[PDB]
Amino acid sequence: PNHPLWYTLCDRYGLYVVDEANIETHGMVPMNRLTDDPRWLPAMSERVTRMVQRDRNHPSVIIWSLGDESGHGANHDALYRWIKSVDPSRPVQYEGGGADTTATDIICPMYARVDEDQPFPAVPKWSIKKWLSLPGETRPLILCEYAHAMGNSLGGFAKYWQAFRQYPRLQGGFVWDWVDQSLIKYDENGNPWSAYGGDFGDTPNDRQFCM
Amino acid sequence: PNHPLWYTLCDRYGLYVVDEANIETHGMVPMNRLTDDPRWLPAMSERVTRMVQRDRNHPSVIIWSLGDESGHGANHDALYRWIKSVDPSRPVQYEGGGADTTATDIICPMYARVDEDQPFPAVPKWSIKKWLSLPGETRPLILCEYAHAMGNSLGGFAKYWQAFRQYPRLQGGFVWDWVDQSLIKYDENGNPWSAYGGDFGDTPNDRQFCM
Ligand code: NA
Ligand code: NA
Ligand code: NA
Ligand code: NA
Ligand code: NA
C-alpha cells in the first residue's frame, strides 16, 4: 500500500488503482512455504485486512490484490474470502501459484506472452489468447505485469495491444514498470551519476535489475 | 442422410460420422423464412425424426446435424430438443444463424478464419480462437466446413492445425470438400471430358463452383 496521499491524487486526477497487500515471499522454497503455514496467517491477515480498513473509501481503488510472488497457500484462500465477505464492492486478484487459483477473480499473470505458450510445470504461463478459453474457464484476463521495460526494450508491445483490442475478455495489463530504481551517487569531482546493484558494496546483488 | 451402406462401412472401417437431416433452404430470403414458419414444422420434423429412427443404432454416427444453410428458426429449436429428448447419447450441432445458436451443442462455423475476424452483420464469423473466449461462451469449436479446396487451393491449411493442436477447445473440423462434382461429356471423337456448371445448357449456373 502506498503513501496515503497517492490514493487522493488518484481519486482527483482519475486513475484506476490496484491496492496491493504488503506480503511478498519470493525467496521461499517453494514460494508458498510461509503462505501455506497457518502459523503465518495472523501476520499475513494483518497486512491484508488493515489495507482495506484504511483504503476502502477511495473511489480510485477498483481492485484488491492479496500481495505478490508468494506462491499459493490456504492463507491466500482464507484472506480472499475475508475480503469478499468484508468488501463485496471490489474484485480481489492475486498472481501467485498459477495466475488462475481459487484466490483470484481475474486471470492476472505476469509476463504471459501473446501468442507463445510457455508450458512450465505446475505454473505454466499460457499464451493470453489461449488462456481465456481453457476448458471450464470463464474469468477475464489482465496481466498484473507485462512488457519488461528493462534497458532498450518494450519490443513486441503492439502485439499485446492488438490482442487486447480483438479479444473482449482480454482487458489489458500493467507494464513493468514506471521508474528506474537507480540511486544518485557522487564521484571524486563531486559529480552525480546513476548507480544500481553492488554499487554500494552491497552483495549478493542483482545489478542493473532494479532498473 | 446417405446410402445405408455408408454407415455399415463407417462402422467396420472406423470413421466418426455426422449424420445430417435433408434440409437446406439456403436460397430463401431471409434464410429462415420457412424454418421459422410453424407451417413447415411438420415437413421439417419428418426429415429429422426419420433420420434418427433409421440411423440411431450406428456407432459411426457420433453427432446429429439439423441441416445446412437454412438460417435459424423456431423449428430448429423445436427439433433440436426432440433429438436431445429421444437420443441423449449424441450431441446435436447446427450452423444456421451464426453457428452458435441455442440449437447447437457445438460451435460449428463454416470458413471462420484462424486469426482474422469477419464481423458480418447479425451473423459474424469470428476468428475461431476468438469465438471460444467470447463472454459467456463455453462450448467446443469444430468447423462444419473449412479450407475450401477449389482449384489451386488449401493455402494456409497449416495455420488451422497448429491452432487445433494449441487450443484444447478447438477440436478440428471438416474440410470442404472431398471430391470435385464434375461430370463426363464426350467430344466429336467420342473422347471423355470433365464438365461443370453451364456445360449442359443449364442456366442460370454457378460455373466451376461445383468443384
Ligand atoms: Na478487449
Ligand atoms: Na527488477
Ligand atoms: Na484440440
Ligand atoms: Na449465374
Ligand atoms: Na461449392
Measured between CB atoms, which of A135, A138, A167 is closest to B130? A167
Q: Which positions of A are catalytic?
A: 69, 145
Query: Which ligand has the shortest distance to the CA of B161?
Result: 3
Q: What are the residues whose beta carbons fall under 8 Å from the beta carbon of A118, sequence distance 6 or more?
A: A112, A124, A125, A126
A102 CA distance to ligand 1 centroid (A)?
23
Residue with cell 446435436: B92
- Which residues in chain B have Cβ-Cβ distances shorter than 8 Å to A135? 168-169
Measured between CB atoms, which of B117, B136, B169 is closest to A133? B169
Measured between CB atoms, which of A130, A136, A138 is closest to B167? A130
Q: By the 8 A CB rule, do A194 and A180 touch?
A: yes
Provide the 3-class DSSP secondary structure of residue A5.
Answer: helix
| Contact state of B133 with A135 under an 8 Å Cβ cutoff | no
Question: Which residue spans within chain A are E strands per DSSP?
Answer: 17-20, 61-65, 92-93, 141-146, 170-175, 183-186, 192-195
Alpha carbon A169 to chain centroid distance?
A: 19
For A200, how many CA atoms within 13 A lie in the half-sphere containing its CB?
15
Residue A82 burial class via C-beta count within 10 angstroms: exposed 0-12, middle 13-18, buried 19 and up = middle
Q: What are the residues whose beta carbons fall under 8 Å from the beta carbon of A84, sequence distance 6 or more?
A: A92
Nearest to A47 by CA among A17, A8, A9, A75: A75
B135 CA distance to ligand 1 centroid (A)?
11
Measured between its terminal Cα atoms, the distance across chain A in Å is 21
| Contact state of B168 with A135 under an 8 Å Cβ cutoff | yes
- Residue A121, preceding bond cis, omega within 30 degrees? no
Technique behind the model: X-ray
Nearest to B17 by CA among B6, B29, B5, B31: B6
Q: For residues A75 and B149, give the distance between their C-alpha atoms in angstroms, rounded to a whole number.
A: 57
DSSP letter at B59? T
User: Domain range holding B10?
Assistant: 1-211
Torsion, Cα B164 B166 B167 B168, to 10 degrees, reads 90
Query: Which ligand has the shortest distance to the CA of B181?
Result: 5
Report the CATH number that the domain containing residue A108 is assigned in CATH.
3.20.20.80
- Grid cell digits, residue A206: 542483482
In what helix (H) or strand (E) does residue A81 lie, and over which residues does it extend?
helix A74-86
Provide the 3-class DSSP secondary structure of residue A175.
Answer: strand
Q: For residues A161 and A171, give the distance between their C-alpha atoms in angstroms, rounded to a whole number.
A: 10
| Contact state of B129 with A130 under an 8 Å Cβ cutoff | yes
Residue with cell 510457455: A118
Alpha carbon A122 to chain centroid distance?
A: 19
Q: Quick one: residue A36, left, alpha or beta (phi over 0 = left, psi -120 to 50 = alpha)?
A: alpha
What's the helix, strand, coil split of chain B in %, to 5?
A: 25, 20, 55
Helix B41-55 vs helix B74-86: angle between axes, to the nearest 10 degrees? 30
- Which residues in chain B have Cβ-Cβ distances shorter than 8 Å to A166? 117, 127, 130
Q: For residues A187 and A85, give the distance between their C-alpha atoms in angstroms, rounded to a whole number.
A: 55
Q: For residues A120 and A114, give the distance between their C-alpha atoms in angstroms, rounded to a whole number.
A: 16
* Number of A–B residue contacts, CB under 8 Å: 34
Buried b (16+ CB within 10 A) or exposed e, A93-122: bbbbbbbbbebbbbbbbbebbbeeeeeeee
B135 to chain A, minimum CA–CA distance in Å?
7
Beta strands across the sheet bearing B92-93: B17-20, B61-65, B92-93
- Grid cell digits, residue A195: 548507480
Q: For residues B158 and B59, give the distance between their C-alpha atoms in angstroms, rounded to a whole number.
A: 30
Residue with cell 473482449: A168
- Residue A93: strand pairing partners: A65
Residue with cell 469477419: B118
Q: For residues B120 and B125, give the distance between their C-alpha atoms in angstroms, rounded to a whole number.
A: 6
- Amino acid at site B158: A
Q: What are the residues whose beta carbons fall under 8 Å from the beta carbon of A89, sequence distance 6 or more?
A: none
Provide the 3-class DSSP secondary structure of residue A163.
Answer: helix
CB atoms closer than 10 angstroms to residue A69: 16
Q: CA geometry: angle at A181 spanning A179 and A186, to 5°?
A: 125
- SS3 of A17-73: EEEECCCECCCCCCCCCCCCCCCCHHHHHHHHHHHHHHHCCCCCEEEEECCECCCCC
Q: Which residues of A touch B (CB under 8 A)?
A: 117, 127, 129-130, 132-136, 138, 166-169
Measured between CB atoms, which of A130, A167, A168 is closest to B166? A130
A88 CA distance to ligand 1 centroid (A)?
25
What's the helix, strand, coil split of chain A in %, to 5?
A: 25, 20, 55
Q: For residues A115 and A99, give the distance between their C-alpha atoms in angstroms, rounded to a whole number.
A: 17
Give φ, ψ of A142 to 5 degrees: -145, 120
Q: By the 8 A CB rule, do A102 and A138 touch?
A: no
Q: For residues B76 and B48, give the distance between their C-alpha atoms in angstroms, rounded to a whole number.
A: 10
B170-176/B183-186 β-pairing: unpaired
Q: For residues A129 and A167, give the distance between their C-alpha atoms in angstroms, rounded to a whole number.
A: 8
Structural domains in chain B (count): 1
Candidates B126, B133, B170: best to mutate against A (most CBs of A within 10 A) is: B133
Nearest to B66 by CA among B92, B99, B35, B30: B92
Q: By the 8 A CB rule, do B127 and B114 touch?
A: yes
- Grid cell digits, residue B205: 449456373
Residue B145 appears among annotated catalytic residues: yes
CB atoms closer than 10 angstroms to residue B138: 13
Q: What are the residues whose beta carbons fall under 8 Å from the beta carbon of B162, sequence distance 6 or more?
A: none
A183-186/A192-195 β-pairing: antiparallel
Q: For residues A38 and B42, give the distance between their C-alpha atoms in angstroms, rounded to a whole number.
A: 66
- Grid cell digits, residue A65: 490484490
- Write out the binding residues of A for substrate: 69, 145-148
B177 to chain A, minimum CA–CA distance in Å?
28
Q: State which residues have CB under 5 angstroms from ligand 2, the bound ion.
A: A 209
Q: For residues B31 and A189, give the distance between their C-alpha atoms in angstroms, rounded to a whole number.
A: 84
Beta strands across the sheet bearing A17-20: A17-20, A61-65, A92-93
Residue with cell 481465456: A132
- Say which of B69, B95, B137, B188 is annotated catalytic: B69
- Residue B150: strand pairing partners: none
- Which residues in chain B have Cβ-Cβ distances shorter than 8 Å to A169? 133-135
- SS3 of B63-101: EEECCECCCCCHHHHHHHHHHHHHCCCCCEECCCCCCCC
